[PDB]
Each structure stands twice: as C-alpha cells, then as structure tokens.
Design goal:
This is part of a larger assembly, with eight protein chains of eight kinds. With 156 residues, chain A is mainly β. Chain A has one helix and ten strands; from the N terminus they run αββββββββββ. In chain A, the strands form three sheets. In chain A, strands 2-1-5-6 form a four-stranded antiparallel beta sheet, with no helix packed on it. A four-stranded antiparallel beta sheet of chain A has the order 3-10-7-4, with no helix packed on it. Chain A has a two-stranded antiparallel sheet with strand order 8-9. In chain A, β1 and β2 form a beta hairpin. Chain A is flat. Helices cover 25% and strands 13% of the residues of chain D. The two termini of chain D are 32 Å apart. The relative contact order of chain D is 0.09. By secondary structure, chain E is of the alpha+beta class. Chain E is 23% helix and 17% strand. Chain E has three helices and five strands; from the N terminus they run αβαβαβββ. In chain E, the strands form two sheets. A three-stranded antiparallel beta sheet of chain E has the order 2-1-3, with helices on one face. A two-stranded antiparallel ribbon of chain E has the order 4-5. The longest helix of chain E has 10 residues. The chains are: A mainly beta (156), B alpha/beta (148), C mainly alpha (80), D alpha+beta (71), E alpha+beta (115), F mainly alpha (116), G alpha+beta (59), H mainly alpha (85). The interface between F and G is small, with 14 and 7 residues. β4 of chain A pairs antiparallel with β1 of chain H, so a sheet runs across the interface. Chain E: One of its GO terms (biological process) is mitochondrial translation. Chain E: Belongs to the universal ribosomal protein uL30 family. Chain E: This is Large ribosomal subunit protein uL30m. Chain E: GO terms for molecular function: structural constituent of ribosome.
Chain lengths: 156, 148, 80, 71, 115, 116, 59, 85
C-alpha cells in the first residue's frame, strides 16, 4: 500500500488526525469551566447577542435600537424578553447555540419605544405601449425596540 | 423615491428607553366644528372617546377648540418640538381613534426614509476590524524584504 | 449558434430522472383495487355536490333595513 | 488562537478567544499651474487626474451640505 | 403530432431491487401519497395543467395528501414528471381527535402526533 | 366653457415636485417630467428586489474576505456552520466579521474543525 | 477598540502595501491575487464605493 | 445546506418547521407568554387541516375496503343460500 513520495501521491491539503475522545472531552470540560468561571466572576464588559426576532437575525447590544417592520401588539414602553438568542459574545468568549441558546443562559430584554408607520413607499407598474400604468402608495407599520440589557448566567 | 426625499438614521429623542419610557406626544389639539358634516366624526369622537383617551394618556394635554379654521384638524405636538397636523375631515369615529392612537404611539421624529433598521452607539465589543487584525507580527517588526 | 450540454445540466437532468423513477416505484403499489375503490367515496361526493347546489340556489338579494335608510339623516347631525 | 468546546450536553458551543498582545520583541523603537498641480496630487495620493478637476455649480449645489450622521 | 402518452404498464411494476432501494413493501402497501409539485405546468399540455389543478398541486413545494388508489394513481401517472411522490408514514398511527392539532409532517414523510 | 378645470396647477405640481431633482427640462416641463417620473417610480419599485439581492452579495463578499483571512473559503465556512447547526445568517456573519473579529475567528476555527 | 473616532476610522480604512513575487508564477494567478487586493475584496469592510483598495507591489 | 438538513431529517429550509420558527419570538419581561404569532397560528391551522384530511382519507379507504368485504360475503352467502331444496 506504500506509495513513493510524489506530487500526487498524497492529497495537497494537510492530513487531519482526530484527537482522542478522552483528551477532547478533558479539554472541552476545561474550556467550559474556564468560561463559566469568567461568567461567575463577571469578567466581561459589554455583551452582544445575535437574536432571531420577527423573521430576521439582529446583532444586538445594550442600548441598541431595532426597527421591526410590523406592529407588535405591545404598548409603547412595555418591556419584553427576546427568547430566540442564537449567539452571545463578550470580549474574551462567545456562546453558540445549536441553533438556540437556552433560556437559562441568556436573557435579552427590550422595550417598545415607538410604534410608527414607514415613509410612503411607491409601487408603480408600467408596461410600454399597453396603456398599462398603475400607482399605489403603501405605508408599513413599524415598531422601534430598545435593547435594555443582555444578561448571562453561569449555567454551562 | 429615496433619492428625491430626505432620509435620517434610526434614533430616539432622549434615549427614550434606557432609564424610563417617556411618551413623546405631549399635546393634542382638536379643532372641531359644531355644525358641518365634515366634523361629524370628530364630534362623535369628542363625545365618546376623547375622555377615555385623555385618562389613558395622562401625559398628553388635550385641547378641544370647537371652532376650527378650514377643515377640522388634530395638531399633535411632541416633546422634541415636532408638530404634526392631521386633517380629521370626513373621518369616522374609529378612523379618528386609530389616527389619534397612532399619533400617541409615534415619536416626533420625521416620518421619512430610515437608512438603517438599527442603531448602535457601540457596534463593536471585540474591536472594529482593521487590516492589522488577524495579521501576524514579525520579529523586530521587520517589513518584507527588509535587510536587517 | 450551437449550444452544448454541461456537466451541471446533465446532473440536474439526472436528479430529475431519479425523482421520476421513485415516483414510478411509489405509483406501482396501489392500496385498493379498481373494484374495491368503486363507490367508496360516493356519499361524500354526493354531500359535497349538495353543498355546491345549495350555495348555487341560495343566491338572493340581501335584506333592506329601515335603520339603514334612516341612518343617513345623521349627515346633518350637529351640536345644539 | 481559539479554544472550542461543546458543553457536556452538547447543546452550546463555547469559544474562548482571549486577545493576544503583540510581543515586545516584534516591535521597532519609535523614530525620532492646474495641470502640474493635479499631476502632483495624483502622484501623491495614487489616484488619477479626474478626481482633482473641479465640478460645475449644478453638481456642487446638488451635494447635500447637512448629511445625516449616524453614531 | 403531440398527444397524450400511454405509459406501458411494465413501467409501474416494481422489482425486488426497487423494493430494496426505496423501502416499500408491496404487501401491505402504503395508504396515502404525499405529492408535491416540483415542476412548473407552464409549457406543459392543458391536460397536465388540468390534472395539476384537480390534484390541488397549484402551489409548488406544498405537500398534498392523496389516496393511493387506482384513479388517483392514474392522474398522478399523467403528471408524474411534475411531482414528487412519497408515501405518508404514520409511526404513531393516524392522529386522534385529542392531538389532531399537534401534528407535524416531517420531511421524511412521517406524520408525527407530537410537535 | 360651462365646466373648466381649475385644479390643473395642482395636478401639474404633484408630478413636478417629484421631478424637481432631474436634469434638464425633465424637471420643468410636465410633458417630459411625467415620463421620467413614471420611469423613476418603476425603477424604485423594481429596485426593492435588487437591494435584497445586492445586500446578500455584499454579505457574501465580506464573509469571503473575513474567512480567507483565516484560510477558510466561504463555501466551507457556510456549509460547516450548517453542519454544526449554527444558523447564523449571512447578514449577521458579515456584521460579526466587521465588528467582532474574534467571534468570527471562533466561527472560522469551528468550521475548519468540523471540516476536519 | 477604545480608539477615538478619527483614529479608529483611519485604522479601519488605511491602505496596506502587499508584495507579490512573480518569479516562476503564472501571471493569471498573480493577477487574481493582485486584483482582489487592489479592489479591496480581501477586507470585510469592503464596499465598491468605499475606496478600500490596497497597494500591490509585484516584483 | 439543504441536502445535509434533509439527510439529518430536518426541513431543507431552516425557516421551515423547527425551533427557530415555531417557538415564540418574545414574551413579557414578567414571564407571561406572548399571544401566538399570526404565522404560527396560520401554520397550526394548515397542519390541523392536513391531519384532518389524512384521517378522512384513511377512514374512507378503510370503510371502502370493509364494504367491499361485506359485499363479497353477502354475495357468497346468498349464492349458497340459493341451494335450498
């Protein structure tokens, strides 16, 4: 099965060896414990979170403003918990959900600051030489949310 | 179109949600006519809904003039100084109710195109990317092809 | 100008053909026979057409109300 | 320089990425007419000449002097 | 001339190799098809368009459940190049009235009574 | 002239206001203004597709640059993130590339690890 | 991070000088590398209107 | 990654059925659940109609088979009962 060392004898990409599962689990536990201790001792400043709200993912931090393109059935000034957090990150560590982080880990809270309409959007249809011309003006409801705080808990 | 229209960035008035929420609508002024079918809906709104709205929104001072100029109107004045005038001509009671609630909910900022659906004053926590992030350093800071 | 068939086009056609072959297989195993299926849905089909006929034959002008006629007097309602 | 680790349940990935400082040894001590003008500017800023020619009053008036500012 | 195509019956006679490949037992056949339209009826004959409308496959990629009976199968044979057919699998049996509102059609073709 | 139009001024101005930023007589003459305003509105309507298309192209370009900074190619990054069940979208990935380089470095390392 | 606004912007949009060695290299592969760098498509902050290209010195 | 998702038995589109679209987006900061989202309600109604159709079609086919069996039994028992002399 041995092949002499030629240009095409081996794949160009470097060979990859799977680490032994015992050492992999040991290293995983060590890293998780280190990050959990950082969370316990509060060794982090600002937190950012990627949160799935409405239909989209928002990269979010405390004091941030977010413009949802629909009405939310919430009074202005009402506080809310954004429950679908995909990612939370600090300066020195990040936590990734698969695909979502647990409710125990992260708590992202927002506040309905504004309920508005968008500026008028023009929908015009035109087809040449067909007397085909149509115009419509649409205003989309919108809600401005302010992200008040992102909290993480040592539940790793 | 966007190119033939002013635009702004998403913003609040005084960081309206950080410490507490302050309703930005501060004044409503309904100019309503005693006679004239144009203000029939406004008259019914004053009879049936303006009191409930006023007690739901204690921070908004509501005036009812009962003698308008031109068409019956509602002038909404906001904390940031914005003045939005909405004609309530020939609108039904429910139409006026929804319009007034919309005025109460919205801020005084211009209803124009908003460039970004978000606004961060701290877009970066780990440090904004610059070309020298992810670039390894070299011994004694020697640039490529440097002799020493 | 001539046109040529790419490997991507061939692969797309092959994917479609595989889907169709699986369709053939799944169509090759009927649950009931043609004699067993005869009339097994007749009651439901008859009821559905009865509903269609009822909708077709219930068409009639809507009612007219004195309240609707008289409410128009409110166009001149004022404040005394 | 990133440490990756699934949690024990395997439902969240934990990334440890401390910021690495630049070693002292990897640093150096601090040291102690229209035509010709446009050619000089183009050479200085590695641009072409076309950038430095003026524009008409129509374009200049079209430019917005109070642009919206974010952050 | 272009006409309707009469598919020979041997096309719809599965082989043991086919049974192994696709995982369906000819004895105790599946009761219900899940048919999804995956091809446009545009540039297809009016009879194929009509069959698609009859089967309720106007929206592409929207699963529709049909009986696995000879008449439905004849229509499906007419439009077999425009659709994907997969058997409906019921690991927990057909849903009961209690959990009729808690079902979900998994991408594998299984109607699960928990969601 | 029993009935004559008296609003033609305002009917004209409704179009001219949208035409005011055009070049040449298209901003003044209604006959020319109305044709270019209709074209402008049709372009505005059709450009909502191109805005979404170009944003994804921009995100993919930025993600490609950021991942090439770590030796990954964009297909590898995206596919391996999917296989690791990380459902971050391209907008968010581009934002992380620009503003959280260490988080993006972690994601690239994760994608390469999954690949290996 | 923690830079002032102007220095931060300057750092982010500064143009870098790259060196390619053309010895025994395909001109097309050299050109692919150089064109990416010249456009700035190697920067995550790339945008066609940001003028974020870099200098490429090919020897 | 649609093919990989299909192999793992998920929706090819992550925007399809899954936690990211079927869970509530938000809840009140107190802890009270939010009213169901319009898309989630519509999707639940569609799934209920699909399940009801599955039940209806299955029951109709089963009843048809049972009726055919009974018809066969009646035919054979009648042809046997004709032998009475």
């Amino acid at each position: 099965g041995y092949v002499p060392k030629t240009s095409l004898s081996s794949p160009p990409w470097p060979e990859v060896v799977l680490p032994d599962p015992v050492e992999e689990t040991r290293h995983h536990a060590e890293v998780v414990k280190k990050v959990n201790e950082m969370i316990v001792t509060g060794q982090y400043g600002r937190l950012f979170a990627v949160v799935h709200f409405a239909s989209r993912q928002w990269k979010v931090t405390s004091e941030d403003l977010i413009l949802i393109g629909n009405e939310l059935d919430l009074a202005c000034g009402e506080r809310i918990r954004l429950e679908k957090v995909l990612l939370v990150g600090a300066d020195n560590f990040t936590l990734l959900g698969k695909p979502l982080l647990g409710k125990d880990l992260v708590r992202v809270e927002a506040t309905v600051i504004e309920k508005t309409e968008s500026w008028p959007r023009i929908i015009m249809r035109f087809r040449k030489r067909k007397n085909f011309k149509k115009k419509r003006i649409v205003t989309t409801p919108q809600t401005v949310l302010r992200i008040n705080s992102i909290e993480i808990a040592p539940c790793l | 179109t966007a190119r033939g229209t002013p635009s702004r960035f998403l913003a609040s008035v005084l960081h309206n949600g950080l410490g507490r929420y302050v309703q930005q609508l501060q004044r409503l002024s309904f100019s309503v006519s005693r006679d004239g079918a144009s203000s029939r809906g406004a008259r019914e709104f004053v009879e049936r809904e303006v009191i409930d709205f006023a007690r739901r929104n204690p921070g908004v001072v509501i005036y009812v003039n009962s003698r308008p100029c031109c068409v019956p109107r509602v002038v909404a004045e906001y904390l940031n100084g914005a003045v939005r005038e909405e004609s309530i001509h020939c609108k039904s009671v429910e139409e006026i109710s929804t319009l007034v609630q919309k005025l109460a909910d919205q801020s005084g900022l211009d209803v124009i195109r908003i460039r970004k659906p978000f606004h961060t004053d701290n877009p970066s926590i780990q440090g904004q990317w610059h070309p020298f992030t992810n670039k390894p350093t070299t011994f004694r800071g020697l640039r490529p092809r440097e002799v020493q | 100008r001539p046109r040529f068939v790419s490997l991507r086009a061939k692969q797309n056609m092959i994917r479609r053909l595989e889907i169709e072959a699986e369709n053939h297989y799944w169509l090759s195993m009927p649950y009931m026979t043609r004699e067993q299926e005869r009339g097994h849905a007749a009651v439901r089909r008859r009821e559905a057409f009865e509903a269609i006929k009822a909708a077709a034959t219930s068409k009639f002008p809507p009612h007219r109300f004195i309240a609707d006629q008289l409410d128009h007097l409110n166009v001149t309602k004022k404040w005394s | 320089n990133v440490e990756l680790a699934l949690t024990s349940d395997g439902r969240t990935i934990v990334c440890y990425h401390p910021s690495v400082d630049i070693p002292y040894e990897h640093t150096k001590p601090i040291p102690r007419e229209e035509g010709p003008m446009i050619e000089q500017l183009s050479k200085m800023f590695f641009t072409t000449k076309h950038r430095w020619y003026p524009h008409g009053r129509y374009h200049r008036c079209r430019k917005n002097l109070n642009p919206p500012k974010d952050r | 001339k272009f006409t309707r195509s009469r598919i020979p019956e041997k096309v719809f006679q599965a082989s043991p190799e086919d049974h192994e490949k696709y995982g369906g037992d000819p004895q105790n056949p599946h009761k219900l098809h899940i048919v999804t339209r995956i091809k446009s009826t545009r540039r297809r004959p009016y009879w194929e368009k009509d069959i698609i409308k009859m089967l309720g496959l106007e929206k592409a990629h929207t699963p529709q459940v049909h009986k696995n009976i000879p008449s439905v199968n004849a229509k499906l044979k007419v439009v077999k190049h425009l659709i994907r057919i997969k058997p409906l699998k019921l690991p927990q049996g057909l849903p009961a009235e209690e959990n009729m509102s808690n079902t979900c059609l998994k991408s594998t073709g299984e109607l699960v009574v928990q969601w | 002239l029993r009935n004559r139009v008296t609003d033609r001024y305002f009917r004209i101005q409704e179009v001219l206001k949208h035409a005011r930023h055009f070049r040449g007589r298209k901003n003044r003459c209604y006959r020319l203004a109305v044709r270019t305003v209709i074209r402008a509105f049709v372009k505005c309507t059709k450009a909502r597709y191109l805005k979404k298309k170009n944003m994804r192209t921009l995100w993919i370009n930025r993600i490609t640059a950021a991942s090439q900074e770590h030796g990954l190619k964009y297909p590898a990054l995206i596919g391996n993130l999917v296989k690791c069940q990380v459902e971050l979208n391209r907008k968010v990935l581009a934002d992380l590339a620009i503003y959280e380089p260490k988080t993006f470095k972690s994601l690239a390392a994760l994608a390469s690890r999954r690949r290996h | 991070s923690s830079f002032s606004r102007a220095p931060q912007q300057w750092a982010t949009f500064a143009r870098i000088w790259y060196l390619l060695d053309g010895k025994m290299q395909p001109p097309g592969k050299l050109a692919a590398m150089a064109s990416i760098r010249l456009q700035g498509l190697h920067k995550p902050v790339y945008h066609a209107l940001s003028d974020c290209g870099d200098h490429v010195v090919i020897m | 990654g649609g093919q990989w998702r299909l192999q793992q038995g998920l929706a090819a589109n992550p925007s399809g059925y899954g936690p990211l679209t079927e869970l509530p987006d938000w809840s009140y900061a107190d802890g009270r659940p939010a009213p169901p989202m319009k898309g989630q309600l519509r999707r639940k109604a569609e799934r209920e109609t699909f399940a009801r159709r599955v039940v209806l079609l299955s029951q109709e086919m089963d009843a048809g088979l049972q009726a055919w069996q009974l018809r066969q039994q009646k035919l054979q028992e009648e042809q046997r009962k004709q032998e009475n002399a």
